[PDB]
Design a protein around this ligand. Sequence first.
Ligand SMILES: CC(C)CCC[C@@H](C)[C@H]1CC[C@H]2[C@@H]3CC=C4C[C@@H](OC(=O)CCC(=O)O)CC[C@]4(C)[C@H]3CC[C@]12C
Ligand SMILES: CC(C)CCC[C@@H](C)[C@H]1CC[C@H]2[C@@H]3CC=C4C[C@@H](OC(=O)CCC(=O)O)CC[C@]4(C)[C@H]3CC[C@]12C
Ligand SMILES: CC(C)CCC[C@@H](C)[C@H]1CC[C@H]2[C@@H]3CC=C4C[C@@H](OC(=O)CCC(=O)O)CC[C@]4(C)[C@H]3CC[C@]12C
Ligand SMILES: CC(C)CCC[C@@H](C)[C@H]1CC[C@H]2[C@@H]3CC=C4C[C@@H](OC(=O)CCC(=O)O)CC[C@]4(C)[C@H]3CC[C@]12C
Ligand SMILES: O=C(O)[C@H](CCN1CCC[C@H]1C(=O)O)NCC[C@H](O)C(=O)O
Ligand SMILES: O=C(O)[C@H](CCN1CCC[C@H]1C(=O)O)NCC[C@H](O)C(=O)O
Ligand SMILES: [Fe+3]
Ligand SMILES: [Fe+3]
Lengths: 601, 601
Amino acid sequence: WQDELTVRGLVAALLIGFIYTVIVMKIALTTGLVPTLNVSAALLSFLALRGWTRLLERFGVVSRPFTRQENTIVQTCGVACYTIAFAGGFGSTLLGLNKKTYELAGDSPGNVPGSWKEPGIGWMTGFLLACSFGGLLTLIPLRQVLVVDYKLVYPSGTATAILINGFHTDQGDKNSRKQIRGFLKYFGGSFLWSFFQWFYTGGDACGFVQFPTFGLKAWKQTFYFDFSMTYVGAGMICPHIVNISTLLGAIISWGIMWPLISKNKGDWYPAKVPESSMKSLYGYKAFICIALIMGDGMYHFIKIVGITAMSMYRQPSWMAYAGYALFSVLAVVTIPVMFKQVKWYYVVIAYVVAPMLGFANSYGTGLTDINMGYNYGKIALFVFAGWAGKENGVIAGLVAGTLVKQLVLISADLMQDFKTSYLTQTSPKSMMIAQVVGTAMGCIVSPLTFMLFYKAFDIGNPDGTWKAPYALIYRNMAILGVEGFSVLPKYCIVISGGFFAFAAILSITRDVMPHKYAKYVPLPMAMAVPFLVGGSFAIDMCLGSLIVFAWTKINKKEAGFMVPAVASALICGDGIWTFPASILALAKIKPPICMKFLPAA
Amino acid sequence: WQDELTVRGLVAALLIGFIYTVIVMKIALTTGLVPTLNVSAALLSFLALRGWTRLLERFGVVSRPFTRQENTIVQTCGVACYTIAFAGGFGSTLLGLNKKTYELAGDSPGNVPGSWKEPGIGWMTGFLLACSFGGLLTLIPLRQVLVVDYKLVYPSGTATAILINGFHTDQGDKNSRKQIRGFLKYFGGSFLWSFFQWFYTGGDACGFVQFPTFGLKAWKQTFYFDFSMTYVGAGMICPHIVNISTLLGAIISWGIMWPLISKNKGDWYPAKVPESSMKSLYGYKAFICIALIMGDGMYHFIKIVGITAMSMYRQPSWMAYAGYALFSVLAVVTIPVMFKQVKWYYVVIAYVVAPMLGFANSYGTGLTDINMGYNYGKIALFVFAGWAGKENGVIAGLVAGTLVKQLVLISADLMQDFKTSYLTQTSPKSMMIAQVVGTAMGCIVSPLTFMLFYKAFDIGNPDGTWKAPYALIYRNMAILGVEGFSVLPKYCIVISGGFFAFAAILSITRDVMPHKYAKYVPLPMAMAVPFLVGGSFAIDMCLGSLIVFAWTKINKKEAGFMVPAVASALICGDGIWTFPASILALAKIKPPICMKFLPAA
Ligand SMILES: CC(C)CCC[C@@H](C)[C@H]1CC[C@H]2[C@@H]3CC=C4C[C@@H](OC(=O)CCC(=O)O)CC[C@]4(C)[C@H]3CC[C@]12C
Ligand SMILES: CC(C)CCC[C@@H](C)[C@H]1CC[C@H]2[C@@H]3CC=C4C[C@@H](OC(=O)CCC(=O)O)CC[C@]4(C)[C@H]3CC[C@]12C
Ligand SMILES: CC(C)CCC[C@@H](C)[C@H]1CC[C@H]2[C@@H]3CC=C4C[C@@H](OC(=O)CCC(=O)O)CC[C@]4(C)[C@H]3CC[C@]12C
Ligand SMILES: CC(C)CCC[C@@H](C)[C@H]1CC[C@H]2[C@@H]3CC=C4C[C@@H](OC(=O)CCC(=O)O)CC[C@]4(C)[C@H]3CC[C@]12C
Ligand SMILES: O=C(O)[C@H](CCN1CCC[C@H]1C(=O)O)NCC[C@H](O)C(=O)O
Ligand SMILES: O=C(O)[C@H](CCN1CCC[C@H]1C(=O)O)NCC[C@H](O)C(=O)O
Ligand SMILES: [Fe+3]
Ligand SMILES: [Fe+3]
């Protein structure tokens, strides 16, 4: 509980959060493709504190030793600081409320003239403070069930824990240096492989990432193999049933269902509207994907409640939810004050389903390491926009979309650190203090960082440097969302309801049979991840499982303790390169070559 | 001497030679890019004879065991049969004598109307028989000096010998199965890597072979890294001084000399004529390349003669040269009968320099595994065309170009098998019998195979399927060659003479210093190989030396006996795939995808 919270750690976390906020914010306001930087934060937290201790030792100043528990605290505090930068919708949703996006959207029903709000320090900071801490309190009951009871493996959380453990190991065990040397060989190889790939991804859909390994026809169906060691490494430490389910979901959606649905491009949905829109082939993608997750997610949530209810019938869990209710009512009486377009009971509905929605995202992140939190926000934005008419509907959808996205996204990304703390033997009490401190600085720094960018430069211009494409894209969903569920394509609800029931049946089927049949049951929400992303992620995960399957047969003993080290090195090596790659995009240094693939034209 | 020459081996070699002639001839008359198929012949010779013995055992017929010595005989006899198909200039030079190429070349000085000859069984077979056996007799004195005295490593000969040895090993030694399993792991990996590469080389200069590893600017200077395991594997078993010399030659020519010469595209040589022509930047490439080889080649040839002359002064070698003189005078009194355009003393000059020219090619092939025999023919074609005026000059250049090319190319490719026989403990006496028998069938089958293609189809049409581009290209060199050395670009002879002297000085310098300085002297004709081919071959060879250098430091003991096995597997794996790739081109099955690289346009 103590010896892990230090003043130097607070300074280090504050600095790491500040630069990582600037990197995230600048990328968000220029391209909207914010990268994952959690792994890089662990390395920077390690280097900064070891450098400070050595520099003081050089000057003769003695300092307390820097252990792995303190490294986890600094990394966790730093991550929470810059997570608010993109979880708060500064480049997607909150920027969609400005006047510039209102004019670009044009004149249409729902887009009434009173649907713009201007950014400011006073209201952005208060908006974040009220709602950011809501997700933190939900984590405490979720930490027990997911991290250790359900034994969910968080591949990025597990990889970071091994990386942090390898930094602070000092005693010469016989298996330790076999692991450390194995980690270092593949860490350098993966980092150099990612560095080599960068020079050839200099165009739209070209490079080693867009490699048509099984042909150009299968590549267009997203059934290729990108040379991503993050997904290959993640699949190595995931169970085979998770990897098989991921591929099985990609086959059903991209190999069968989407081609069959696309044959009705003129009947079921209009063909003039572009794809990736909620009226054309993306309503199928978004609603079927959540229905698979929600159908599986609800049953486990009811099962936990049902088990808990029976246990107390037979006879700090309520402390966290009491604080959550206190923060819930605080947002209920504050958010409508800032936005008169948002009614009081809109916030109430958002805060009741958030523990239930946050659980599903955390469970899904604990299976496939994919955070779908921003996908929940898109559905909630569409639904909440339909709960209001043309008047006060666009702002209501955007504001309520930020609420659902934050409590869902924050919960899943911050379960990554609890898995890291579990493996590094860090006290959960000290973790939550770093959770609150990191979130508190994030709710202060990010509004300040955004407005410095906002005042100095011009963000939102379609023809310019600081272009925020997702500010207008998120605005259009709310404009499309003011109309009810009628705008969804034909049979969209019927198919979604069928997949909701099908997901529930698998959850029923898995838990009712004996274990010697129950391990062949595919996981419904591991299936749902490739419904939105392509099947390349599924192929990469299965390749990682194939490597472990072959390795175990060849050498059972070595694969027992070397698979986690090799898999973590592959994840960390690609994760570390994400930091220099972001700096290159920060300085506008584009790749020189574009590796295109053509049909022998 | 016996137990290696068998009737079943003769039948197997005759069959393997016949199909390989058809594959070579069809590719020669359609694209002119004849591939290397020596490695594949060893595998097919092994499978055919093992299949025959097992099939007879299944039917109850008992047969003599099939040893590795018999496998070397069959492979050597088969190789000599189909080597004549492309060494005889059936698709480049002999096809340039037909009337179709004469009309396509147009009306120009030197291209007199009496400069066409039509193909036929009677004269093609007699032309080959007179001159093909000339190179065989020169091999006997060359076998002693090059294979074992000079200890030249023939990477394709060494790789084939290890492949043949691994086929016929039966006793469970402790290091044998470590070598066999190491060979098989990299043989399958290299073969599958070559198979994977094929689907993406579906265009002009696109694919993994044309990979700009160091940028597009360096790729245009041929300073990239093609993913060729043949050159990487060849460089592994070559000494470091050979690999370093190869890179050092590529730096001088492509990195320095060619860019400097190209700055005078309007002054030194005319700019209207295209490159790769003897009047524009290719006279520099061709004449400087030979001058480096000839300067080094002459000194070693004089050194052997000087050493031999001193030895006999102090006091079967002459049997081979007595037979060579007998075959030399036979061609002198026969070739001018077929071609009245060729004078008797043209053949005499060709047959005197052929042992001296053949030695240099065999020495160069024993260093870098690159056969430059067809490059000698281009120089001899140009020179002999200049020895005659506009009258009887084009045919004289073409016919004399075939003579010089055959005795030079045959000598170098057939020293590959003598290195194979040396490592497989095959009797040299039985090797020469397979040399003569294989050449005798080659001089019969190839004229017959060519005319069956010639009579049935239409070869030589620029707009058609059976197009022979090199038939017209070789015709144009003779047309350009009737004019003397004045057509060469400015300072072409001066620079060539400077490199001839510079090559000689290194040969002087290497043999005069003590050995503890003599190992740093670059080899002049290992430098000359990247003067015509790009520097990618140099980079691949140096990467192979880097792998061996790192492997030796990490584990001295294992790298001692596993480097030849791994290197041979890389060469054999790419060599084996050359057979199915040729069948795909035989059936006109083109690669589906073309992996292009663009400057981020
Ligand atoms: C033993 C293991 C390592 C096997 C290797 C994987 C194969 C199963 C893959 C690798 C390359 C793949 C091929 C790569 C490219 C194509 C081109 C594709 O043709 C196209 O449609 C390209 C575009 C066009 O031609 O219009 C058809 C599938 C095919 C043959 C793929 C079939 C499956 C292949 C052979
Ligand atoms: C074992 C691990 C490492 C993954 C290997 C998977 C591939 C070898 C196979 C398995 C699933 C196959 C896919 C299954 C389904 C389809 C759907 C099919 O889609 C269509 O029918 C086209 C629809 C249209 O016309 O739009 C094309 C082949 C493809 C992509 C197949 C291509 C090859 C895949 C990716
Ligand atoms: C530790 C080892 C493995 C180092 C890895 C090799 C590097 C030394 C190579 C690999 C990629 C190479 C780069 C690949 C591509 C380019 C693009 C090239 O720019 C171009 O001219 C492309 C065409 C254009 O932009 O017009 C400049 C060199 C550079 C940076 C190359 C510089 C050298 C690099 C970094
Ligand atoms: C260590 C082994 C594995 C090989 C690694 C070699 C590369 C790292 C280096 C060594 C030689 C270098 C080349 C040396 C000379 C040149 C010549 C230079 O040519 C020009 O000046 C351009 C002339 C023009 O404008 O036409 C461009 C850089 C280049 C290709 C360099 C690119 C990078 C190379 C290939
Ligand atoms: O939101 C989006 O769809 C895109 C890409 C998806 N986001 C990028 C990484 C995190 C993810 C997310 O949001 O969780 N981001 C728009 C700008 C910014 O990321 C934001 O959301 O404000
Ligand atoms: O000769 C050439 O320049 C080209 C490519 C080079 N030849 C192909 C492989 C062997 C090499 C050689 O000839 O030794 N071949 C033209 C047709 C045929 O190969 C022939 O030469 O009759
Ligand atoms: Fe986003
Ligand atoms: Fe040729």
